[PDB]
Write a protein that holds these residues in place. Structure first.
Motif, PDB file in Angstrom:
ATOM      1  N   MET A  84       0.780  -1.203   0.000  1.00  0.00           N
ATOM      2  CA  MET A  84       0.000   0.000   0.000  1.00  0.00           C
ATOM      3  C   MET A  84       0.828   1.276   0.000  1.00  0.00           C
ATOM      4  N   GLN A  85       0.762   2.008  -1.111  1.00  0.00           N
ATOM      5  CA  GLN A  85       1.419   3.304  -1.226  1.00  0.00           C
ATOM      6  C   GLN A  85       0.612   4.352  -0.386  1.00  0.00           C
ATOM      7  N   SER A  86       1.325   5.302   0.146  1.00  0.00           N
ATOM      8  CA  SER A  86       0.864   6.486   0.813  1.00  0.00           C
ATOM      9  C   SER A  86       0.314   7.437  -0.239  1.00  0.00           C
ATOM     10  N   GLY A  97       3.144   9.498   6.643  1.00  0.00           N
ATOM     11  CA  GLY A  97       3.630   8.836   5.415  1.00  0.00           C
ATOM     12  C   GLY A  97       3.117   9.524   4.171  1.00  0.00           C
ATOM     13  N   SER A 129       2.102  12.744   1.675  1.00  0.00           N
ATOM     14  CA  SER A 129       2.833  14.022   1.461  1.00  0.00           C
ATOM     15  C   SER A 129       1.797  15.047   0.939  1.00  0.00           C
ATOM     16  N   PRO A 175       7.186  22.619  -7.657  1.00  0.00           N
ATOM     17  CA  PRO A 175       6.332  22.339  -6.512  1.00  0.00           C
ATOM     18  C   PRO A 175       7.137  22.089  -5.237  1.00  0.00           C
ATOM     19  N   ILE A 192       7.025  19.818  -1.915  1.00  0.00           N
ATOM     20  CA  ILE A 192       6.257  18.582  -1.457  1.00  0.00           C
ATOM     21  C   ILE A 192       6.699  18.314  -0.031  1.00  0.00           C
ATOM     22  N   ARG A 210       6.511  16.116   3.516  1.00  0.00           N
ATOM     23  CA  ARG A 210       6.141  14.804   4.041  1.00  0.00           C
ATOM     24  C   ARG A 210       5.440  14.974   5.385  1.00  0.00           C
ATOM     25  N   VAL A 267       9.897  16.974 -10.837  1.00  0.00           N
ATOM     26  CA  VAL A 267       9.950  15.870  -9.809  1.00  0.00           C
ATOM     27  C   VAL A 267      10.432  14.652 -10.594  1.00  0.00           C
ATOM     28  N   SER A 294      12.803  17.685  -7.175  1.00  0.00           N
ATOM     29  CA  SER A 294      12.667  16.672  -6.093  1.00  0.00           C
ATOM     30  C   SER A 294      12.897  15.287  -6.747  1.00  0.00           C
ATOM     31  N   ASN A 304       9.648   5.298  -5.472  1.00  0.00           N
ATOM     32  CA  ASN A 304       8.413   4.491  -5.367  1.00  0.00           C
ATOM     33  C   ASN A 304       8.846   3.015  -5.152  1.00  0.00           C
ATOM     34  N   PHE A 305       8.265   2.430  -4.108  1.00  0.00           N
ATOM     35  CA  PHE A 305       8.640   0.989  -3.871  1.00  0.00           C
ATOM     36  C   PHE A 305       7.493   0.390  -3.040  1.00  0.00           C
ATOM     37  N   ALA A 312       5.619  -0.786   0.026  1.00  0.00           N
ATOM     38  CA  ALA A 312       5.815  -0.438   1.441  1.00  0.00           C
ATOM     39  C   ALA A 312       6.548  -1.533   2.186  1.00  0.00           C
ATOM     40  N   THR A 338       7.490   3.832   4.385  1.00  0.00           N
ATOM     41  CA  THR A 338       6.306   4.117   3.567  1.00  0.00           C
ATOM     42  C   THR A 338       6.796   4.734   2.230  1.00  0.00           C
ATOM     43  N   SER A 339       6.024   4.504   1.214  1.00  0.00           N
ATOM     44  CA  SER A 339       6.345   4.968  -0.149  1.00  0.00           C
ATOM     45  C   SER A 339       5.098   5.713  -0.635  1.00  0.00           C
ATOM     46  N   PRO A 340       5.242   6.705  -1.455  1.00  0.00           N
ATOM     47  CA  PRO A 340       6.512   7.170  -1.994  1.00  0.00           C
ATOM     48  C   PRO A 340       7.242   8.105  -1.030  1.00  0.00           C
ATOM     49  N   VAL A 341       8.556   8.127  -1.176  1.00  0.00           N
ATOM     50  CA  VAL A 341       9.409   9.052  -0.400  1.00  0.00           C
ATOM     51  C   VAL A 341       9.861  10.130  -1.405  1.00  0.00           C
ATOM     52  N   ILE A 342       9.591  11.374  -1.091  1.00  0.00           N
ATOM     53  CA  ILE A 342       9.966  12.435  -2.120  1.00  0.00           C
ATOM     54  C   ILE A 342      10.969  13.348  -1.439  1.00  0.00           C
ATOM     55  N   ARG A 376      13.565  16.620  -1.475  1.00  0.00           N
ATOM     56  CA  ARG A 376      13.821  17.880  -2.167  1.00  0.00           C
ATOM     57  C   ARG A 376      15.325  18.068  -2.340  1.00  0.00           C
TER      58      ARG A 376
END
Ligand SMILES: [Cu+2]
Ligand SMILES: [Cu+2]
Lengths: 110, 110
Positions: A1-3, A35, A37, A75, A77, A79, B5, B37, B41-42, B44, B73-77, B79
């Motif tokens: 499950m993605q956030s 988790g 954003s 943008p 972003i 978290r 991004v 940024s 994506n992976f 969780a 947790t994903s996605p991690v973004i 900056r």
């Protein structure tokens, strides 16, 4: 499950709204979990995004503990790392007093 | 002008690659500017994203100054706020030694 990556203001993005209640109605339609954003989209150089510590400062748009500014690239972003209330504003000019501010409640993911 | 991004690994996302040079070929095809940024994506709980300070630690996959983990947790973004070389790895198991690590050079936006 993605956030989830929520787009602040959906198609409207981050700007000074026509109605002062715009971003609080937007936030009340979503559920924000640790988790996820928040993505703020705006024309470069016109606004910024700053997180405030306390409700009192957010309410008064008082940026005395705020950071000189500096970055206006979009943008932005952010978290959502911690539970509880988070407050974000734009510190340009009178934008915060004109409604460009957002408070959201972050809950756990499990 | 909006910042970009970048999606790390494009459609492949962030995982342990079949070839160890995968992410350095991906990074050499892009230009990264302050303000952009990086989105990792992976699935969780299977990997994580940690930025390292020095090339030596990144090269050796040595995580002694690394943070205990915690968030998968994903996605991690992330900056890209500063100029110069940035190093990111996955600290799970042997993933970094198996090529799940990325070094990129960030240049100015103007
Ligand atoms: Cu503004
Ligand atoms: Cu991994």
């Amino acid at each position: 499950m993605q956030s989830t990556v929520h787009i602040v203001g959906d198609n409207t993005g981050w700007s000074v709204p026509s109605s002062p209640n715009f971003y609080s109605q937007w936030a009340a339609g979503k559920t924000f979990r640790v988790g996820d954003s928040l993505q703020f989209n705006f024309p470069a150089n016109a606004h910024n995004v700053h997180e405030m510590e306390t409700k009192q400062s957010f309410d008064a748009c008082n940026f005395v503990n705020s950071d000189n500014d500096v970055e206006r690239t979009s943008p932005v972003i952010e978290r959502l790392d911690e539970l509880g209330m988070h407050y974000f504003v734009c510190t340009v000019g009178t934008h915060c007093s004109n409604g460009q501010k957002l408070s959201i409640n972050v809950v756990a993911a499990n």
